[PDB]
Design an enzyme around this catalytic site. Structure first.
Site: not given
Ligand SMILES: O=C1NCCc2ccccc21
Length: 277
Positions: A39, A133, A135, A138, A151, A164
């Site tokens: 990253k 977050d 989802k 992720n 994430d 989200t």
């Protein structure tokens, strides 16, 4: 500790993802032939957008994770312009990809993958960390088709942000506040999505989605596995203190004891062979 690594130690390859204030690039370490998902974050841009707290939290949370259902941070380094996070590479990509590929999961695959997420959340929540977050975008999949949650820039460490739209919990819309139970709401949306093929709350824009969420406005398709339906009804509950799995409901024991999970062996999920998708 090994000497700090540096860009020249790697052969960089394709871009794997282009996140919020970062880009994730596939990289092969020359000395070891190991593949990492690195990253990359530009310092100036982070400073300019007031995201130093954001990136600092991301690194601090990831350093604390030591569990097979989570991304691993192996190393960090920087040069004049950029920060680099050496992360585990999830070869099979996003859970979302498989949801779209096969449309929806059968009961066996729903059960197995729901259990891994629950088991991951139990570990995370035991360390006082909220994801905020969660989802299918992720939740990644390894070469071995076990999950790897990612994430953490937006994570909250217990003792300011909205995720989200489709997975946002009601309390975030009505209080600005997040708790562990906010992740359990997300879990309910995900289980519904695995079974139905689509997220529970859908509309033409964020405003209308947020509207449905706070009115608890959704319903189940006819075929929905009955026990999974009961479970989702026990997770998609507006009152955050009444969701199965939260502290006020006596934690993960009763969640894991749900009838939907009857056949699950919780102790060694990572040692089990995932059902074919
Ligand atoms: O494989 C990955 N590991 C680290 C997190 C990530 C983000 C976006 C795309 C791939 C990855």
């Amino acid at each position: 500790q090994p000497r700090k690594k540096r860009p020249e130690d790697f052969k960089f390859g394709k871009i794997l993802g282009e996140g919020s204030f970062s880009t994730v690039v596939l990289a092969r370490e020359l000395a070891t032939s190991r593949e990492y998902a690195i990253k990359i974050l530009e310092k100036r841009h982070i400073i300019k957008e007031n995201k130093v707290p954001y990136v600092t939290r991301e690194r601090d949370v990831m350093s604390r994770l030591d569990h097979p259902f989570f991304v691993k941070l192996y190393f960090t380094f920087q040069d004049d312009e950029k920060l680099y996070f050496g992360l585990s590479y999830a070869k099979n990509g996003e859970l979302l990809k498989y949801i779209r590929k096969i449309g929806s999961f059968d009961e066996t695959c729903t059960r197995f993958y729901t259990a891994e997420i629950v088991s991951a959340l139990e570990y995370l929540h035991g360390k006082g960390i909220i994801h905020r977050d969660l989802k299918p975008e992720n939740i990644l999949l390894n070469e071995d088709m076990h999950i790897q949650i990612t994430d953490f820039g937006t994570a909250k460490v217990l003792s300011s942000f909205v995720g989200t739209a489709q997975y946002v919990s009601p309390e975030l819309l009505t209080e600005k506040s997040a708790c562990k139970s906010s992740d359990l709401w997300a879990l309910g949306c995900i289980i519904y999505q695995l079974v139905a093929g689509l997220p529970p709350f859908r509309a033409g824009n964020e405003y209308l989605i947020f509207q449905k969420i706070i009115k608890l406005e959704y319903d189940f398709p006819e075929k929905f596995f009955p026990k999974a339906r009961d479970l989702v009804e026990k997770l998609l509950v507006l009152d955050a203190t009444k969701r199965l799995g939260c502290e006020e409901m006596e934690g993960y024991g009763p969640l894991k004891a749900h009838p939907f999970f009857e056949s699950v062996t919780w102790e060694n999920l990572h040692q089990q062979t995932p059902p074919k998708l």
